[PDB]
Symmetry: D2
Subunit: 329 residues, 4 copies
């Protein structure tokens, strides 16, 4: 019995006795993700290089992928009639949906995560977090300022060697592989769980001169294990979505702590940290700033940044122990 994302979302909606907005919202996200994936794989690029001459395009139309991905998500999400407030990594202000297309959900997303990797063709993706409108007053950015703990759904689409959508909800994380031949997401891994301990650490060591003492000690242990065990392997794709997905399926730890230029970390809380922390916790993993659970942070700005350490429980707990140690004084 093959299960598609459409059938999965549909069934989860019935068992939850929902009106249907969530189901319509997730269906729309699915459609947006497929449209972004096709664009990312460069389908139709021949037209941009004049295969049919230049009789159609009479003006600027060469949209960058990150801009195009943003337009697809915003437009497709709006046409779902299930959202009221949208927060995008590419927009300064929150987007308030017209009354005519207004729904009950708040969506925070990162249209094309891994900007620096776009031009070198390295894996990139889309990250999303979904909240249910809390207050009863007019929708505003405030509706997006909820602790990740309030998330009803979160996940990401990875445009890697293949395109995969990872969806996390109250009862677990499920992985769907996109079959581009039929434009259908196929459930390939249900109720995913991260391993208790991995053997890979992921972090940009270029900021070494600015790491706090705990991060410094932890990395030293990965390379020169005090107990003489085997050193961990290192991997840093440069796109959060790619490094986090590898962490989920292979185990290990991912880190982006604070540094000189980024005193409160670089990654954004609403559409990078929280969605990933939610997926991680639903998979049996941990996500911390090194001092507190990411999902417990109360956002004060829609573009707020936060340090983040996530991955296998035992690996993240070891780092937390080091932070506690350097705080005991």
């Amino acid at each position: 019995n093959i299960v598609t994302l459409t059938r999965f979302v549909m069934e989860e909606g019935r068992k939850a006795r929902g009106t249907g907005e969530m189901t319509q919202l997730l269906n729309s996200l699915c459609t947006a993700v497929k449209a972004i994936s096709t664009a990312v794989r460069k389908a139709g690029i021949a037209h941009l290089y004049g295969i049919a001459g230049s009789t159609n395009v009479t003006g600027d139309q060469v949209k960058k992928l990150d801009v195009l991905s943003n337009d697809l998500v915003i437009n497709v999400l709006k046409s779902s009639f299930a959202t009221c407030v949208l927060v995008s990594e590419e927009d300064k202000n929150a987007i308030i949906v017209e009354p005519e297309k207004r729904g009950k959900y708040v969506v925070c997303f990162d249209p094309l995560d891994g900007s620096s990797n776009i031009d070198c063709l390295v894996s990139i993706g889309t990250i999303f977090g979904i909240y249910r409108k809390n207050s009863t007053d007019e929708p505003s950015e405030k509706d997006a300022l909820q602790p990740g703990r309030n998330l009803v759904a979160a996940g990401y689409a990875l445009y890697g060697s293949a395109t995969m959508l990872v969806l996390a909800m109250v009862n677990g994380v499920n992985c769907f592989m996109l079959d581009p031949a039929i434009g259908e997401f196929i459930l390939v891994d249900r109720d995913v769980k991260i391993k208790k301990k991995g053997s890979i650490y992921s972090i940009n060591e270029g900021y070494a001169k600015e790491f706090d003492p705990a991060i410094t000690e932890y990395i030293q242990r990965k390379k020169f294990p005090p107990d003489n065990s085997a050193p961990y392997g290192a991997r840093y794709v440069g796109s959060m979505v790619a490094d986090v997905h590898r962490t989920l399926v292979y185990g290990g730890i991912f880190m982006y702590p604070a540094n000189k230029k980024s005193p409160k970390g670089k990654l954004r809380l609403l559409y990078e940290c929280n969605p990933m922390a939610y997926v991680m916790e639903k998979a049996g993993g941990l996500a911390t700033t090194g001092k507190e659970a990411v999902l417990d942070i109360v956002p004060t700005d829609i573009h707020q940044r936060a340090p983040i350490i996530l991955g296998s429980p035992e690996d993240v707990t070891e780092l937390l122990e080091i932070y506690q140690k350097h705080a005991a004084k």
Copy 2:
């Protein structure tokens, strides 16, 4: 006008007034790469998950991507009637083409580089090097034991966010993007040249405990610039093809030195180091083991390994100076 890979190779073939055997070889390579890309992107995966029931399957047809990639390259290259000897990262022995389909070219290739990144969907690719048989004796593995400097063509196909084929030849390096909508590689970057100096270093620091003093000094310098400039950023996808491609388009340096487990380096000379070194040099970059030019090494084993350092001239040269410094003490 628009230039497809097919027209590019055809044209280049006519320029050097060739019999067309090399042209057919490149055409076949193009076909193999497109076929591998389609499989990598998981087209038709729905059938494996029973969309059409379990009536189609009759045995145990569950070929892993790496085995499929190897079968595709081998079968397609043989069908080109342009090769006599094939060396694959997946085969312990060189493959001697039957007399009927025998051609004069020797091809060394890595069907699906980035084995550890296959399951986590991170970028992977195909690497190839082409030599002309320089002998009259019956074809044997010895025909593949030529220094990289003898290559007539080399390159790789990167199955990342998009699929790109990079081809280096005597005249230079050119990049073609695969437009999956029409199955055609489109020339998008002519006579590519790498930046003289970059700002990214790429290495698996998990082997820090095993690096020689030169590698160690260089890495420290990247994190703690003596001139107090901004430290280099770090990136290590884990797939040579992906890290090297980024090195080529963004500049910087890629390293895989020797360590305890790999005293002679891990990467293989014939289908990993040589092809990438040739692409690098044709692009104005450098490729060294730290003590000699990769392309000058005369191999004695088709699966010979070698340490490798490649990338922007100034960056590689800086590391070479550290090596030369220690050897002068």
Copy 3:
């Protein structure tokens, strides 16, 4: 506001306050149609011709398209958990769905209509009719023996120059174009209505020697109009789905009356005639055997055949007038 089939089916389900089975059933049909379309367009045929050699397929697996289409519909429909009885043009007996996957709907379908056109690559398609389980006793073929008038939904997917799905339900016919780049059916024509009168007649005139007097007279009028108006144009693709679709969008008339070898017509009532008659009537057209409305016929066999004349109201009414004339005696 772009509308996809998924969103259309979802909304129609909500407005109807249905449990969700219909929506799941239509979603499944959508998925099956995309899988058949990709196969029909021959994606992956290179593998059948040995592009990767012959290492996987160790036995028979070269399924004919008509057989494959049948497996996809049956399997996908079953996994919807919304059906109890299935009638296929390719199966002698009705298919009774397992209690575990049993739903309330009865589906009659023609997996790949236009058998004679399969090998010459002329347009072919899939036709479907959906009934709601009436009786309360165990499901049997009897549940499929309902007059077309009881249909809750019907339509077809045309695999022509492009793939299109036409869906007819209680309040109208809607046309969805499949965008293969994203595997998404896009609503392109809503609440379709056939023109009152067309200028094209479609019938296999090869059976002329066996046509009844009314058909003979009608065809004579199309070629030699008694009032000297312009003669009608003739078109007969040979695939009912193609000829009927053209009739719907261009207007005119389609005919397949009785003949020597086919005394009660050739087309089957449950999965060819009724579905098309329903689409036609919902579009403001007519569908008759020449003596009675197709949708009013009470089926006595699941593979019962029936003569059928359908299309623009004025064109079909003219033929009915001729039948009445030749019956007045």
Copy 4:
């Protein structure tokens, strides 16, 4: 082994030791056809219906398929540097290629045959004929006014249930199926030969009132066989490319004789009749106006029309005997 169109043309080019200009011309044609097929199948249509909002569009970029097909062929053929004169069914005047991209071949083509079938999604296609410039004078339309017998290559691409390219050359007719998954034409039928006698006749009988006595007698014979055998079945898709392809693979006969509106026949000699006549004769079939061989007609107008009868030898010959009979009374 597996043979792609690219390898087939390349090989054939080497056999006749050509400079490779014809090879590049065929390669370009292959690219144009794949691009047309993708558009015909409606890839990316979702963008036209606002999936990404209305920010991409800036003017009135709504090119109809026929105009797009014409722009693709023209642009791609010019980019081949192998042509000097182009004749399109869509252009009133012959297109003379600029001196820079000038080659020695003259190409006559029908970019999207079956205009009336475009909107109803019935099979459509591209027809082409290639001549070598036989003169030293500056290229002009006169170079395209050669009898079909001078063709060096001709064929068509049928965008039906699947996309197939049929190529005829001095040595024979070969059929290649387009595998859209990898964008490659695969040889699936070598040295095709039409059946000596068929069982299908194809003509628009709507012009019955205007047919000459020979056509009328022949059709009556197909419906009322004097030998009392089974009558021929009828088929008329309405797109020459589709009806002719079926004629080639199933045998039988295709006819488009003169009528009141088209006293010299409707189909055009240079890009409809000649290409199909050449394919037919290379396949062992016949092509006549009823009074002379189509390939022997020396045109005086690039848009010259001609009556045409083509298909299985015995069938065509039977009709010719009727013509000869009347001319002998």
